[PDB]
Amino acid sequence: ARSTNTFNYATYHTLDEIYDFMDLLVAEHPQLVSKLQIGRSYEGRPIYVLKFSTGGSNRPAIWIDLGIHSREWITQATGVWFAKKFTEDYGQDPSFTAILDSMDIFLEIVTNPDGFAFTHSQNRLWRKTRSVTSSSLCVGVDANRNWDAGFGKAGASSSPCSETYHGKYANSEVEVKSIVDFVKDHGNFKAFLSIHSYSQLLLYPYGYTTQSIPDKTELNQVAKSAVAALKSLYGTSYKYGSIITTIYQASGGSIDWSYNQGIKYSFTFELRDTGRYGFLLPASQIIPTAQETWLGVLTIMEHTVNN
Numbered sequence: 001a002r003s004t005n006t007f008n009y010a011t012y013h014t015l016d017e018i019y020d021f022m023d024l025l026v027a028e029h030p031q032l033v034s035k036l037q038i039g040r041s042y043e044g045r046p047i048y049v050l051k052f053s054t055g056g057s058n059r060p061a062i063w064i065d066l067g068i069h070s071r072e073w074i075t076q077a078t079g080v081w082f083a084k085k086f087t088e089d090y091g092q093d094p095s096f097t098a099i100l101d102s103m104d105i106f107l108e109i110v111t112n113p114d115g116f117a118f119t120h121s122q123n124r125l126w127r128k129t130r131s132v133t134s135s136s137l138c139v140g141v142d143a144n145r146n147w148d149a150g151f152g153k154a155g156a157s158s159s160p161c162s163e164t165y166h167g168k169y170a171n172s173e174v175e176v177k178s179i180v181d182f183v184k185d186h187g188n189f190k191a192f193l194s195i196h197s198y199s200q201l202l203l204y205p206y207g208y209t210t211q212s213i214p215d216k217t218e219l220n221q222v223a224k225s226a227v228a229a230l231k232s233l234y235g236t237s238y239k240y241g242s243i244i245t246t247i248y249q250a251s252g253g254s255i256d257w258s259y260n261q262g263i264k265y266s267f268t269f270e271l272r273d274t275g276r277y278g279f280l281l282p283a284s285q286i287i288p289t290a291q292e293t294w295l296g297v298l299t300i301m302e303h304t305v306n307n
């Protein structure tokens with residue numbers, strides 16, 4: 001409602017409620033958190049990134065995006081919880097305090113706001129952006145097939161009506177270009193975490209090719225350690241490995257792009273569950289999901305500051 005402590009973390013929210021939450025958290029924690037507008041969506045909604053910083057200086061940074069696929073409600077709900085948790089644990093958890101004392105975190109809670117608004121007003125299962133061209137009656141692009149990393153290769157669809165439509169060219173979606181510009185402008189990201197649901201997976205690059213990344217051994221073990229940390233709280237069991245070996249080919253993906261920019265700790269989370277409820281994860285699962293996922297993310301961040 002009126003403070004981040006009266007905000008209900010155990011229910012799903014609208015775009016406007018999440019956007020309001022950001023302003024409240026900035027107001028309450030002005031020495032730690034600022035709200036950045038990195039662009040506007042196809043339909044002209046502001047695209048917001050929360051910056052968590054204690055100072056500097058172009059500090060080494062962690063990127064986290066949630067809700068690129070709009071129907072994956074657990075992700076935006078987890079993003080809100082993450083934002084609050086950062087303000088809770090800074091000054092409290094020594095490990096996390098050390099991360100924020102030397103690094104910045106950039107958190108994008110609603111990466112596809114038009115899709116999110118649309119899952120509230122029209123179609124709960126909508127996944128793509130809401131871009132339209134006169135070239136087709138079909139709406140939207142899969143924003144996680146739109147990145148300039150194996151763009152247009154097997155693992156995406158060239159058909160505008162497809163749910164995995166890659167768009168006409170790489171970065172055609174302003175929601176993607178806004179991130180690309182921000183990350184390129186910055187130049188000093190060390191981790192890039194893209195949060196999705198569902199399937200309980202922790203994935204590293206690549207999706208578009210079977211070629212092993214030169215950091216495979218390391219990321220595989222970081223992934224194993226993060227999965228163990230996550231499992232430790234409530235027993236939630238994740239599988240892990242490269243995108244292509246674990247699911248299948250997928251092209252134009254965010255972490256393939258981020259990894260190719262030299263951002264080593266590039267991972268994609270697929271949160272709860274494994275299909276019991278699927279996209280329609282019960283609200284009662286929001287806080288436990290956010291809690292355990294935090295443990296996994298923290299594990300990755302600790303490897304970033306110490307490397």
Ligand SMILES: O=C(O)[C@H](Cc1ccccc1)C[N+](=O)[O-]
Binds near residue numbers: 196198247255
């Ligand atoms: O099919 C997809 O778009 C995803 C598989 C994937 C996961 C990470 C990078 C690229 C692709 C899963 N996603 O949450 O729907």
Ligand SMILES: [Zn+2]
Binds near residue numbers: 072144196197
């Ligand atoms: Zn997704």
